[PDB]
Amino acid sequence: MENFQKVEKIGEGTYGVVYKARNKLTGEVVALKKIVPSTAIREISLLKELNHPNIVKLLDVIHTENKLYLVFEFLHQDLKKFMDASALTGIPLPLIKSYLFQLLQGLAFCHSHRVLHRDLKPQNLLINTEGAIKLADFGLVVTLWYRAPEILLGCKYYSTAVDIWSLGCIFAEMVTRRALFPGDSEIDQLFRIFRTLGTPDEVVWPGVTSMPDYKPSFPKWARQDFSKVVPPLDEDGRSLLSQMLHYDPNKRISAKAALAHPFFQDVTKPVPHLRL
Numbered sequence: 001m002e003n004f005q006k007v008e009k010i011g012e013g014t015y016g017v018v019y020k021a022r023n024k025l026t027g028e029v030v031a032l033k034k035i036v037p038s039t040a041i042r043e044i045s046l047l048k049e050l051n052h053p054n055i056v057k058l059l060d061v062i063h064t065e066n067k068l069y070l071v072f073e074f075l076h077q078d079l080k081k082f083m084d085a086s087a088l089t090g091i092p093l094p095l096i097k098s099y100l101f102q103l104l105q106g107l108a109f110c111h112s113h114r115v116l117h118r119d120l121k122p123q124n125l126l127i128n129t130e131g132a133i134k135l136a137d138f139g140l141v142v143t144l145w146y147r148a149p150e151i152l153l154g155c156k157y158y159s160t161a162v163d164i165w166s167l168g169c170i171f172a173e174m175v176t177r178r179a180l181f182p183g184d185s186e187i188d189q190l191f192r193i194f195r196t197l198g199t200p201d202e203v204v205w206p207g208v209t210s211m212p213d214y215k216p217s218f219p220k221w222a223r224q225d226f227s228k229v230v231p232p233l234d235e236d237g238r239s240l241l242s243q244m245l246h247y248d249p250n251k252r253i254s255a256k257a258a259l260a261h262p263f264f265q266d267v268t269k270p271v272p273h274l275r276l
């Protein structure tokens with residue numbers, strides 16, 4: 001950044017690499033994403049207006065020599081690193097609950113403005129020492145682990161429900177300390193989902209057999225109880241998770257509706273123990 005001084009590489013985005021950087025002037029510390037289509041520019045510039053406490057702020061867009069730099073607010077840690085760091089002990093349920101609640105407020109906000117994330121995963125969830133968690137780097141090797149089934153089945157016009165699916169996968173992962181559906185190919189991803197939730201059919205998902213990539217030859221697996229899926233999550237949490245993982249996107253719980261689920265009756269805001 002002629003106006004920025006690169007400090008260190010903090011991650012590898014899907015679009016490009018992310019650097020922690022210093023505003024050579026203000027001295028402000030930010031995250032710089034190094035990635036142009038005119039449509040891309042208007043689309044991105046629009047995201048500068050989408051501000052919420054649980055969304056990583058897009059500060060500026062710099063298009064130079066056809067190179068595109070996105071300047072974001074900096075957060076000290078991402079959820080993937082925090083999960084790895086919490087592997088031996090696991091993240092306390094009260095914190096998991098607080099994180100889920102905050103992310104649902106973030107999605108509820110975005111979704112109300114008809115903005116989808118599309119690519120939610122632990123590396124895109126950032127936390128600070130105050131106990132906040134925020135959704136970062138909205139879309140517009142990569143992991144398929146968090147991809148909704150409707151996308152895998154070829155639905156072209158998917159909805160905000162895809163984000164609820166991704167977040168449900170992350171919620172389960174925080175609880176059990178293992179990825180829910182770690183597929184290593186599109187078909188492995190789909191079959192992993194089917195093996196746990198049952199192979200979808202017209203009973204549970206009207207219209208599924210008509211989808212572009214649906215094949216009558218898919219193996220038929222029976223659904224497993226969530227008590228096996230996410231022990232030792234309590235009944236309220238299993239119920240909400242089950243609602244976030246509904247096959248039919250039209251039946252999948254909305255972020256707004258999820259915020260009212262009995263699981264959040266005792267929600268609080270603990271502070272994580274972060275070693276920076």
Ligand SMILES: c1ccc(-c2cc(NCc3cccnc3)n3ncc(C4CC4)c3n2)cc1
Pocket residue numbers: 009010011012013018020031033056072073074075076077078123126136137
């Ligand atoms: C993959 C993994 C993490 C990221 C990633 C990580 C962080 N911060 C946490 C961190 C992590 C390591 C060292 N220092 C800080 N941030 N902070 C803002 C971003 C904005 C870009 C949204 C970002 N992206 C990006 C890609």
